Amino acid sequence: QFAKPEDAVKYRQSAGTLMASHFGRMTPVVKGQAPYDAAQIKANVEVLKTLSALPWAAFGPGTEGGDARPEIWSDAASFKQKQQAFQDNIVKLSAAADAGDLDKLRAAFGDVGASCKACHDAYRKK
Numbered sequence: 202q203f204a205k206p207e208d209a210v211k212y213r214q215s216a217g218t219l220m221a222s223h224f225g226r227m228t229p230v231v232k233g234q235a236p237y238d239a240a241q242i243k244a245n246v247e248v249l250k251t252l253s254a255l256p257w258a259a260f261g262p263g264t265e266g267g268d269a270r271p272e273i274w275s276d277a278a279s280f281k282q283k284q285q286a287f288q289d290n291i292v293k294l295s296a297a298a299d300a301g302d303l304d305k306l307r308a309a310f311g312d313v314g315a316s317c318k319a320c321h322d323a324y325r326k327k
């Protein structure tokens with residue numbers, strides 16, 4: 202769906218912006234600094250699940266640019282493992298939110314954040 206590589210770059214950066222907002226806005230809730238409303242969190246995690254599926258199709262071959270490292274394309278299999286594992290971590294967060302279970306939500310939130318960071322450390326330029 203991208204006329205030039207620059208359009209794929211703009212798309213995946215905007216998806217990252219929205220993912221950071223929908224993930225990070227739950228930090229005060231998992232810390233107990235803001236109240237826990239199970240329905241509010243269930244709906245927010247639904248939005249995060251949709252968004253978290255979107256970046257990967259915008260790293261098609263030849264779309265190099267932005268702060269993407271070249272290791273994404275020459276090692277297709279390792280990059281795919283990382284995005285699939287990340288989306289699995291999001292399934293655990295969705296199961297916790299759907300159950301209304303704050304203990305499971307805290308643990309799943311930490312695992313999701315670690316997965317964001319592990320990919321950025323390997324595949325995003327400093």
Ligand code: HEC
Nearest residue numbers: 214217218220221224267268269283284287317320324325
């Ligand atoms: C690989 C398997 C990734 C996972 C998991 C996550 N991110 Fe990511 N992110 C990734 C790359 C390769 C890039 C660079 C894109 C480019 O072409 O520049 C990014 C970028 C971001 C950004 C910055 C967007 C911008 O302003 O330019 C943000 C804010 C971001 N990513 C957030 C984010 C969050 C919150 C994640 C998990 C919840 C997450 N990313 C996972 C690769 C990967």
Ligand SMILES: O=N[O-]
Nearest residue numbers: 216217218220256
């Ligand atoms: O949102 N980072 O792929």
